[PDB]
RNA sequence: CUAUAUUCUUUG
RNA sequence: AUUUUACCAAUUAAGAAGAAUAUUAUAAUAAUGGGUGUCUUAUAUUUUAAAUAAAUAUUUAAAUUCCGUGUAGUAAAUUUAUUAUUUGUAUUAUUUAUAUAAUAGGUGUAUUAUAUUUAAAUUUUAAAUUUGUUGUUUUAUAUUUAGAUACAUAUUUAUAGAUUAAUAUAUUUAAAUAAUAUUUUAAAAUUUAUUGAAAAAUAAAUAUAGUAAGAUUAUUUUAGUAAAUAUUUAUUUUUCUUUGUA
């Protein structure tokens, strides 16, 4: 489940297709506020600023204070650790490359450039990232 | 050839889809393939089929060529086009000759209409354009008359 | 609903209730069998097919339906149906004053006497004793339980002793 | 939802743009006929239903089965062409085909004698 | 095309009138209880 | 008692499963009796002291449905108390759960009438009709 | 982390 | 003679209407609650109410308790839509049964160790668990059968960005554009809806369980031991020999 079963011969439940997660689910914005990734293809740092700052500034020294204003690469473990959440969209697709922090223009256009979207004149050539159309001078949502 | 295969559940979206997961437009069974070629030994091809194959694969093979070669195609007479009318039209199938004569027949209803597909935008090079400052719009004018159409919502 | 179940993974179909209902038909062919008082649609609809054609024919005026002339009453008055049958072992070669009849259960003691008077011409009947015996149940060789129709045993007491002789 | 309604008849033949996931490798002599039955009844069922639904719906809205109202009813009385683009009718689209065919047959006489003249 | 499933019994007159169908059904049923033809039963559970 | 090894309690578990006859008895109106409103608002003819059979009465009249009468004529001004059994007559005559299947599939939303819960087939063409209706338009 | 600091500087 | 010592052995082809209108998915045309062995009567046969549901939806952006929340008409009645017992065993695939038994009169020993016949020699039940790595605990009578899911692969039409907090800026080389999955069995619990007595029972869910746990299916193999280890992969950096470094 066997041709004898009183279990299966009386219908109970029927399981449906299960919905998939948001394709971008794992690019969480708490990363996108803190860091930014910089790099040439196949080598890219994520860089951040330092916190020692907003508790005690005074009395310490100016050098140790302004060692805080530099962009710095995150430690590689943390970078691998955060990148790993971006690598889980395709396992066993070895020929792929991980998702970036901020969506590039190719990654915006890829969702309208398919052959399943070509009749959708909404969301073509990017829409939701442009400012909205001026509404009819009598336009009202009531 | 084959039609492009579209997937309208590529994410999960429609749940009451029974289906498989994947292309929702699989190649139908009466096409030519490797399996049924390997099973049956003699391949019997009618000349209509030959002509149709060559016809649908022509542009395909032309695009593949390196660009210093594609430039010589018009010089060699490969690219002579019936639409432009440098040659007499070519041999087509029955159905395509039917469609073609259909358009030959229906080309006369678009003459006096400004949306004529066979002569669109004939009014460009006598046209004036005027930028409105009260609300951003650029409106077309011919003979002081506003030709351009403000869109509806 | 402190916590919502995952209901989005089920397609919509009603599961069978686990204390599953048994089928309404009565399988017990024994002594203690109960007639079911509950009336389904099919009873009334089959009535309606029986009395007048319900699907096709238009219904007769109520005055007819509720009158003696209405067909199932008409046909019952002028074409009665009863199997009033006799156990022979009561009337065989012994002289017996009390023959024993099998009777449809819807007959009274009076209706039997009327039956025997007007049809069989049996004009002396002191009285009738009545039993209701559940029909005879038997299994055949496949084990199909079958029950012959219910009957009424009437001991019918006469004035003159009656025998039916067997020539040996 | 969005199942791509616009691609339904787009295909050159009757059997494409149809999701056919019930199938086999080898199709027998009558399974093939079954396939050719299924496809054309898939087109015909879906077309005749879409005819019936709208004809019935137009009839329930009190107008002509075409969706052609009283106004357009008046225009046809007065001999006015009622629409902008008079697309080819059924009889026309049959006529094209047969004239093409009747060209091709004649040509296949002439070619026959041509080739027999050479050979 | 059939107007009743193949496995339904035919209960009707030869004319096709359904006038008597309940009598016919009743008859068939009392007949399935105790067939008139029926020979000696070989069962140990016997009506008498 | 339904719990036992006895056969009476064996029947009662089964016999009690069949479904009783259902009709929709739509509620009585004891205090507004529509059938006595025929005698409302009628002029008297004073010779015979019977009612005057006014021909204007029967076009202003509002027909109040019920089960054991066909319809009951009522003067219009009094129609407003009968608003519920106008909605019970137009209703489908069952629990809506029995007929609910008309609702869920798409083809039966378009072909069936849902106004104040009357599930009833709209007018719908046969196939030959559809064919000859689409044929004489040459489409 | 939230508030007060709003120029290259500053609080809990 | 009254009597031929004691001990020592298996593994079976199956005799047959005792397996088919068979199991599962598949049919986008019917459908007021199926009830036969049924059958007056309805004062006693009423289920309705703008909400996520027997109606179940084609992207990765922006924004929001910063950290589980996200894609908008595709054509306007247009063809994703709740189908079904025969006008093909309906078609296509898929799965399938523990009724049934002559089997052989003796090869090793005969004063105690345990299969290989020349005698001897040699032998602690495996798994999991323990990391002071066991002396502890749990499972296993046997035969047969059921039993658990990360895509080891990308051939011509064809094209790929860095940067600022921001506005901006522009010296400056790649690319096989697809996503759908993620062990397994188990608490004490919770929540919802009924019944009963003066919390219990019945019916629904896939709650969580590295200090509770237990299982996890294919031998004859071919590189070692933050820091380690593992997978894929990289550098011929100088001496007399030698060196796994990344
Ligand atoms: N986003 C848009 O608004 C949008 C998008 C694509 C194309 N268009 C085109 O813009 C033009 C007008 O748009 P709108 O929204 O202002 O009006 P509309 O298209 O909403 O309405 C136009 C009216 O004129 C009819 N019409 C359209 N094309 C016609 C034609 N070619 N010949 C005769 N009648 C025709 C329309 O069917 C309708 O009756 C049309 O070509 C429309 O298809 C507009
Ligand atoms: Mg239907
Ligand atoms: Mg057997
Ligand atoms: Mg044990
Ligand atoms: Mg096994």
Report the candidate in A141, D103, A96, F65 with the shortest Cα–Cα distance to residue B94: D103
Q: Is A27 annotated as belonging to a binding site?
A: yes
Report the candidate in D22, A22, D43 with the shortest Cα–Cα distance to residue B20: D22
CA A125, CA A113: separation in Å to the nearest integer? 8
Q: Which two tokens stand for residue A98?
A: 């991980």
**For the residues of A16-35, what is the DSSP string, one character each?**
-PPPPPPTTTTS-HHHHHH-
Are the C-beta atoms of residues C101 and C85 closer than 8 Å to each other?
yes
Q: Which residue of B lies nearest to C11 if distances are taken between CA atoms?
A: B16
CA C70 to chain centroid: 22
Residue with tokens 């709209």: F122
Q: Which two tokens stand for residue D117?
A: 């003249």
CA A89, CA A94: separation in Å to the nearest integer? 12
Are the C-beta atoms of residues F85 and F29 closer than 8 Å to each other?
yes
Instruction: Identify the three-state secondary structure at position B56.
Output: helix
Does B152 sit in the ligand 1 pocket, CB within 6 Å? yes
CA A66, CA A59: separation in Å to the nearest integer? 13
Q: Which residue is nearest to nucleotide H70 (CA to C1')?
A: A22
Going A83 to A84 to A89 to A93, the CA torsion angle's sign is positive
Judged on CB neighbours under 10 Å (0-12, 13-18, 19+), E29 is exposed
Report the candidate in C87, C88, C60 with the shortest Cα–Cα distance to residue C74: C60
C-beta atoms surrounding A46 within 10 Å? 21
C123 Cβ neighbours under 8 A, 6+ residues apart = C117
Substitution target from D3, D41, D59 for chain F, most F beta carbons within 10 A: D59
Report the candidate in C44, C13, C16, C26 with the shortest Cα–Cα distance to residue F17: C26
Nucleotide nearest residue A53, measured CA to C1': G10
Are the C-beta atoms of residues C104 and C154 closer than 8 Å to each other?
no
Query: For strand G, which nucleotides have at least one atom less than 7 Å from a protein CB?
Result: 2-4, 9-12
Resolution for this experimental structure (Å): 3.4
Task: Assign residue B19 a region (left: φ > 0; alpha: ψ between -120 and 50; beta: otherwise).
Answer: left
CA C19, CA A21: separation in Å to the nearest integer? 38
Three-state SS annotation for C58-78:
CCCCHHHHCCCCCHHHHHHHH
Distances (CA, A) of D58 to D50, D53, D69, E6: 12, 8, 10, 39
CA D23, CA B29: separation in Å to the nearest integer? 8
Q: What are the chain B neighbours of A137 within 8 Å (beta carbons)?
A: 135
Report the candidate in C28, C22, F19, F99 with the shortest Cα–Cα distance to residue A10: C22
Q: Which two tokens stand for residue F23?
A: 């009709």
Describe the crossing of helices C71-78 and C41-51 by its angle, rounded to 10 degrees. Answer: 70
Residue A89, CB-side half-sphere exposure with 13 Å CA sphere: 15
Q: Is B149 annotated as belonging to a binding site?
A: yes
Q: Which two tokens stand for residue C132?
A: 């209701």
Instruction: Identify the three-state secondary structure at position B84.
Output: coil
CA F79 to chain centroid: 17
Describe the crossing of helices D29-60 and F127-135 by its angle, rounded to 10 degrees. Answer: 80
User: Which chains reach chain C with 3 or more Cβ–Cβ distances below 8 angstroms?
Assistant: A, B, E, F
E30 Cβ neighbours under 8 A, 6+ residues apart = C149
- Spell out a b/e string for B74-87, using b for 16 or more CB atoms within 10 Å of the CB, else e: eeeeeeeeeeeeee
Span CA (B64) to C1' (H31), Å: 60
Judged on CB neighbours under 10 Å (0-12, 13-18, 19+), A141 is exposed
DSSP state of F115: G
Distances (CA, A) of C23 to B28, C34, C76, F11: 48, 15, 35, 11
User: Which chains reach chain B with 3 or more Cβ–Cβ distances below 8 angstroms?
Assistant: A, C, D
Residue C29, CB-side half-sphere exposure with 13 Å CA sphere: 14
CA F74, CA F58: separation in Å to the nearest integer? 9
Are the C-beta atoms of residues B98 and B105 closer than 8 Å to each other?
no
**For the residues of E1-48, what is the DSSP string, one character each?**
--SS-TTS---S-SS---TTHHHHHHHHHHHHHS-SS------SS---
Q: Which two tokens stand for residue D95?
A: 């006529």
Q: What are the chain C neighbours of B18 within 8 Å (beta carbons)?
A: none
Report the candidate in F89, F61, F70, F75 with the shortest Cα–Cα distance to residue F32: F75
What is the C-alpha radius of gyration for chain A, rounded to an integer number of angstroms?
A: 25
DSSP state of C23: P
Q: Do A14 and C8 touch (CB under 8 A)?
A: no
The helix/strand count (H/E) of chain B reads as: 5, 3
> What are the CB-based long-range contacts (under 8 Å, 24+) for A32-41?
A32/A101, A32/A102, A35/A74, A35/A101, A36/A101, A36/A102, A37/A100, A37/A101, A38/A71
- Name the phi and psi angles at A36, rounded to 5: -150, 140
Are the C-beta atoms of residues C30 and E6 closer than 8 Å to each other?
no
CA E16, CA B86: separation in Å to the nearest integer? 77
- Name the phi and psi angles at F34, rounded to 5: -60, -25
| Residue A56 Cβ under 7 A from any strand G atom | yes
* Helix runs in C16-70, H state only: 41-51, 62-65
CA D31, CA D28: separation in Å to the nearest integer? 5
Span CA (D17) to C1' (H18), Å: 52
CA B55, CA C104: separation in Å to the nearest integer? 90
Report the candidate in C149, C131, C31, C33 with the shortest Cα–Cα distance to residue C81: C149
Method by which the coordinates were obtained: cryo-EM
Dmax (CA) of chain C: 91
> What are the CB-based long-range contacts (under 8 Å, 24+) for D60-69?
D60/F122, D60/F123, D65/F133, D66/F137
- Name the phi and psi angles at A32, rounded to 5: -75, -20
Distances (CA, A) of C8 to B21, C16, C158, F69: 18, 19, 81, 50
Q: Which two tokens stand for residue F43?
A: 């002029």
Q: Do C9 and A13 touch (CB under 8 A)?
A: no
Distances (CA, A) of B148 to A135, B103, B128, B136, F31: 18, 29, 11, 14, 71
C-beta atoms surrounding D79 within 10 Å? 6
Report the candidate in B139, E46, D45 with the shortest Cα–Cα distance to residue C141: E46
Distances (CA, A) of B108 to B103, B111, C122, D79, D88: 9, 6, 106, 21, 13
Secondary structure of chain F: what % helix, strand, coil (to 5)?
Answer: 35, 10, 55
Sheet with strand B137-142: strands edge to edge = B128-132, B137-142, B145-146
Residue C132's DSSP bridge partners are C152
């Amino acid at each position: 489940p066997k041709m004898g079963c009183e279990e299966i011969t009386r219908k109970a439940r029927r399981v449906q297709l299960q919905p998939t997660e948001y394709l971008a689910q794992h690019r969480m914005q708490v990363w996108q506020l803190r860091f930014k990734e910089m790099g040439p293809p196949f080598s890219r740092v994520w860089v951040a600023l330092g916190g020692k700052m907003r508790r005690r500034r005074v009395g310490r020294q100016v050098d140790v204070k302004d060692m805080r204003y530099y962009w710095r690469p995150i430690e590689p473990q943390y970078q691998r650790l955060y990148m790993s959440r971006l690598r889980i969209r395709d396992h066993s697709n070895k020929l792929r490359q991980p998702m970036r922090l901020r969506a590039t223009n190719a990654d915006i256009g890829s969702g309208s450039s398919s052959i399943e979207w070509e009749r959708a004149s909404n969301r073509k050539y990017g829409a939701m990232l442009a400012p909205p159309k001026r509404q009819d001078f009598e336009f009202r949502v009531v | 050839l084959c039609d492009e295969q579209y997937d309208y559940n590529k994410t999960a979206a429609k749940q009451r889809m029974k289906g498989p997961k994947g292309a929702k437009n699989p190649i139908p069974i009466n096409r030519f393939n490797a399996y049924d070629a390997m099973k049956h030994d003699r391949l019997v091809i009618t000349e209509g089929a030959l002509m149709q194959l060559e016809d649908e694969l022509y542009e395909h093979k032309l695009q593949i060529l390196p660009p210093h070669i594609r430039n010589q195609l018009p010089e060699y007479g490969y690219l002579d086009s019936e639409a432009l009318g440098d040659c007499v039209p070519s041999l087509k199938t029955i159905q395509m000759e039917a469609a073609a004569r259909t358009e030959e027949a229906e080309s006369d209803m678009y003459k006096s209409f400004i949306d004529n597909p066979y002569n669109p935008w004939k009014d460009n090079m006598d046209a004036s354009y005027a930028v409105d400052g009260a609300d951003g719009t650029v409106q077309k004018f011919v003979d002081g008359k506003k030709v351009s159409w403000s869109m509806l919502s | 609903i402190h916590k919502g179940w995952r209901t989005w993974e089920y397609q919509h179909t009603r599961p069978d209730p686990r204390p599953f209902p048994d089928p309404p038909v009565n399988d017990y062919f024994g002594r203690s069998r109960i007639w079911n008082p509950i009336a389904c649609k099919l009873g009334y609809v089959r009535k309606k097919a029986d009395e007048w054609g319900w699907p096709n024919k238009p219904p007769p005026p109520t005055g007819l339906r509720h009158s003696q002339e209405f067909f199932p009453f008409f046909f019952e008055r002028y074409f009665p149906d009863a199997e009033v049958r006799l156990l022979l072992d009561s009337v065989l070669n012994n002289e017996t004053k009390r023959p024993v009849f099998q009777i449809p259960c819807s007959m009274s003691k009076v209706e039997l006497v009327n039956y025997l008077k007007n049809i069989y011409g049996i004009d002396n009947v002191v009285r009738v004793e009545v039993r209701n015996r559940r029909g005879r149940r038997y299994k055949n060789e496949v084990g199909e339980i079958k029950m012959m129709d219910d009957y009424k045993v009437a001991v019918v007491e006469l004035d003159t002793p009656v025998s039916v002789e067997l020539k040996q | 939802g969005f199942t791509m309604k616009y691609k339904k008849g787009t295909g050159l033949w009757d059997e494409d743009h149809v999701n056919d996931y019930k199938t086999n490798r080898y199709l027998s002599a009558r399974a093939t006929m079954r396939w050719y039955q299924e496809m054309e009844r898939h087109q015909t069922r879906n077309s005749l239903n879409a005819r019936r639904a709208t004809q019935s719906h137009n009839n329930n809205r009190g107008l002509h089965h075409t969706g052609r109202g009283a106004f357009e009813r008046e225009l046809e009385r007065r001999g006015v062409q009622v629409e902008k683009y008079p697309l080819t009718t059924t009889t026309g689209t049959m006529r094209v085909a047969e004239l093409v065919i009747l060209r091709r047959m004649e040509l296949e006489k002439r070619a026959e004698e041509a080739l027999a003249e050479q050979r | 095309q059939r107007k009743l499933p193949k496995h339904f019994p035919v209960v009707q007159a030869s004319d096709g009138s359904s006038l008597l169908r309940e009598e016919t059904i009743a008859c068939m049923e009392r007949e399935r209880r105790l067939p008139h033809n029926m020979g000696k039963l070989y069962s140990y559970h016997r009506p008498y | 008692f339904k719990q036992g090894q006895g056969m009476f309690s064996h029947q009662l578990k089964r016999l009690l499963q069949k479904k009783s006859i259902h009709r929709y008895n739509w509620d009585p109106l004891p205090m507004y009796d529509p059938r006595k409103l025929v005698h409302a608002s009628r002029h008297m003819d004073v010779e015979t002291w019977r009612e005057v059979p006014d021909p204007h009465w029967d076009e202003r009249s509002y027909l109040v449905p019920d089960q054991m009468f066909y319809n009951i004529p009522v003067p219009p001004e009094y129609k407003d108390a009968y608003w519920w059994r106008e909605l019970q007559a137009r209703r489908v005559q069952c629990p809506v759960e029995w007929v609910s299947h008309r609702m869920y599939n798409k083809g039966d939303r378009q072909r069936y009438d849902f106004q104040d819960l009357a599930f009833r087939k709209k007018f719908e063409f046969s196939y030959e009709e559809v064919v000859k209706n689409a044929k004489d338009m040459r489409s």
